[PDB]
Design a protein around this ligand. Structure first.
Ligand code: COA
Ligand code: AMP
Ligand code: CL
Length: 661
């Protein structure tokens, strides 16, 4: 069609796959019909195994059909490996002088080029601190509450080295949100830093961790804390240790060697707390062999990473993108990457382009919310940067519309880049539907074709049968892939209910359209999870937080279209009778949400429902009406006949118009 953008000739010549779509389709066909042999060949070619699996013809066992028994997936059972060894040791000594991370702080005077050789030293030191000073054993859980600094990667890899299970808590979560994750994961140890900075905003980390640890102790836990020096904290005697002091306890040889814990294929690698449609965030569990292979193989092909490329992903390790596509995937393929602690607008909106030109970045993986913010700020901030080295631009985490896609390619990338809009989720471990540079014609707004080994389908929402050819409906995956999450920590029943409700399929929770070229167009979540600036958050978590303010009776949270964030957070709420409502009181309710969850959950609009929320006669809030009001779609309010209090509708519209929103 006329909306197709051809891959660049240069990227076709460079591609690991080939210069034409036929090259990709040749491998894809093999990856489906010889699925086991394909993954066995990739696994053997691209990774170190202490022990290999016994049969190339049979590297997966699984059940996707609840009627036949428990849902499960296993990949490479019988194999033995280690993620840290594949990310680091095996690249030495050959690549000891290769830069692993070009680190830059929020402050542009803070920089460091960290080689693979230096990463090895840093990781063996920390691994020995964990083993010998903290007694961290295989399978123990370790919480990370860290900024995007080299130590964050060191910490993830040291835990992998000794077979500990990490759970990374995004540094923007509050103390209450951190404490909840440490309690649910039963962490023995929290690794944090003194502090960070984001633009002009100080980011307390250890001071926040102090309140989280106090809450955990009141609950009967005992959690030690190791604190990296990044930027004078109150350190609790016996509980808290500065990393410099822990390092001083090491013997000389503990700076040089640390034994690798050789892991079985299905040993747990990390727990990542993720918001769902109902209830509190649940920990998605990823194991070792399948996830290692999948994250790294998607990194290689979706970005066409070669050794002469320099890579920059703008995502935080607190989310799956930073796990798969900042630390694990890139280092396993010996990438040279940019590691950036700061924000795109500090000191000003040229900052990311200054990084691109300084480090000769050729592959940039970022998010549509960031792109849309750069678009609003003006093209002069981009055009002062030399972007000649860019050849691949990637987008993750939300739909991108045609205007932002075109701006990314033709302004940001000067019209000499391919764009990889990658669709995937925390639960899928790595990319699932994505272009590949040089071989895949792009349609702006489409994720295009499935990754090797991936079989998506479109299910009819009513019959729940597959639809063939051009079709719209529920996006599902009909067969296993190595990167799939294996369970929800402590709740396999919820895992089966949420993702395997239709026998034979992994259900994504997204809607999608497949077109006549087999390209997929993801249309968004079909449940009650919001996508706020790329971050998924459940409406009921925000509602509960709002309801903890003592003046609040009732609240309902819905998403609404937002020209930068994609989806904003809209709060309808009612206060107790006789409350005097001021900008300050609404500010206090907002601050309560930021105390309970964190700034990522800040309401964008708070509308006071003078007469109450629209409810049925059984007392259930009719959220459909609230979604339509918050979006300004007054003609599509829908049925009011089931409301017990139909008189509230007029006020809700009039207020919304007043706020505008
Ligand atoms: O740009 P940005 O404002 O940094 O990005 P977002 O708008 O997604 O961030 C929203 C909030 O989360 C905070 N945040 C985002 N990423 C963060 C991180 N890695 N660590 C700590 N806080 C973070 C921001 O500082 C901001 O706080 P504010 O509301 O007090 O200004
Ligand atoms: N490329 C994309 N296009 C559209 N939506 C996306 C894309 N990538 C991720 N998403 C959305 O983000 C969700 C995954 O969020 P997360 O688990 O944080 O990665 C998906 O279920 C989609 O709703
Ligand atoms: Cl859920």
């Amino acid at each position: 069609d006329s909306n197709v953008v051809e891959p660049t000739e240069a990227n076709g010549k460079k591609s690991h796959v080939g210069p034409h779509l036929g090259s990709r389709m040749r491998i894809y066909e093999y990856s489906i019909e010889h699925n086991d042999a394909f993954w066995a060949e990739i696994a053997r070619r691209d990774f170190y195994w202490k022990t290999t699996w016994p049969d190339d013809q049979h590297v997966k066992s699984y059940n996707f059909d609840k009627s036949k028994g428990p849902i499960f997936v296993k990949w490479f059972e019988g194999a033995v490996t280690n993620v840290c060894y594949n990310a680091l040791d095996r690249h030495l000594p050959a690549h000891k002088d290769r830069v692993c991370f070009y680190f830059e702080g929020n402050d542009p005077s803070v920089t460091e080029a960290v080689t693979y050789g230096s990463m090895y030293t840093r990781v063996v030191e920390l691994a020995n601190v964990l083993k010998y000073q903290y007694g961290i054993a295989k399978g123990d859980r370790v919480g990370l509450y860290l900024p995007m600094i080299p130590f964050a990667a060191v910490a993830m890899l040291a835990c992998a080295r000794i077979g500990a299970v990490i759970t990374v808590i995004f540094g923007g979560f509050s103390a209450q949100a951190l404490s909840s994750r440490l309690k649910d994961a039963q962490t023995k140890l929290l690794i944090t830093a003194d502090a960070s900075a984001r633009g002009t905003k100080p980011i307390p980390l250890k001071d926040v961790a102090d309140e989280a640890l106090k809450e955990c102790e009141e609950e009967g836990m005992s959690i030690a804390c190791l604190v990296a020096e990044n930027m004078s904290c109150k350190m609790k005697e016996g509980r808290d240790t500065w990393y410099g002091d822990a390092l001083a306890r090491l013997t000389p040889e503990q700076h040089e060697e640390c034994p690798v814990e050789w892991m079985d294929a299905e040993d747990v690698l990390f727990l990542l707390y993720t918001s769902g449609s109902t209830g509190k965030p649940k920990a998605i569990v990823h194991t070792t062999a399948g996830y290692m292979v999948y994250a790294s193989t998607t990194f290689m092909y979706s970005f066409d990473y070669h050794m002469d490329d320099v890579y920059f992903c703008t995502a935080d390790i607190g989310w799956i993108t930073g796990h798969s596509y900042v630390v694990y995937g890139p280092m396993i393929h010996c990438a040279t990457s940019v590691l950036f602690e700061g924000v795109p607008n500090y000191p000003d909106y040229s900052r990311w382009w200054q990084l691109v030109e300084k480090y000769k970045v050729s592959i940039l993986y970022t998010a549509p919310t960031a792109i849309r913010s750069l678009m609003q700020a003006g093209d002069d901030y981009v055009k002062v940067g030399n972007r000649s080295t860019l050849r691949v631009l990637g987008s993750v985490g939300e739909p991108i519309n045609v205007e932002a896609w075109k701006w990314l390619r033709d302004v940001g990338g000067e019209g000499h880049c391919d764009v990889s809009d990658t669709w995937w989720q925390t639960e899928t471990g790595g990319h699932m539907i994505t272009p590949m540079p040089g071989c895949t014609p792009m349609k702006p707004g489409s994720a295009t074709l499935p990754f090797f080994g991936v079989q998506p389908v479109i299910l009819d929402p009513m019959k729940l049968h597959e639809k063939q050819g051009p079709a719209e409906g529920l996006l599902a995956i009909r067969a296993p892939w190595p990167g799939m999450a294996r369970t929800i920590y402590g709740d396999h029943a919820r895992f089966e209910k949420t993702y395997f409700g239709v026998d034979g399929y992994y259900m994504t929770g997204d809607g999608a359209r497949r077109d006549s070229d087999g390209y997929y167009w993801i249309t968004g979540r079909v449940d009650d999870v919001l996508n706020v600036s790329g971050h998924r958050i459940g409406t009921s978590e925000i509602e509960d937080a709002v309801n903890t303010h003592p003046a609040v009776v009732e609240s309902a949270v819905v998403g609404f279209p937002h020209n930068i964030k994609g989806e904003g957070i809209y709060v309808f709420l009612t206060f107790r009778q006789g409350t005097e409502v001021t900008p300050e009181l609404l500010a206090a309710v907002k601050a309560t949400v930021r105390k309970v969850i964190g700034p990522l959950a800040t309401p964008d609009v708070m509308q006071v429902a003078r007469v109450g929320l629209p409810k049925t006669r059984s007392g259930k809030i009719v959220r459909r009406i609230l979604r339509k009001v918050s979006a300004g779609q007054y003609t599509e309010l829908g049925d009011t006949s089931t409301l017990a209090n139909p008189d509230v509708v007029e006020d809700l519209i009039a207020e919304h118009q007043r706020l505008c929103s």
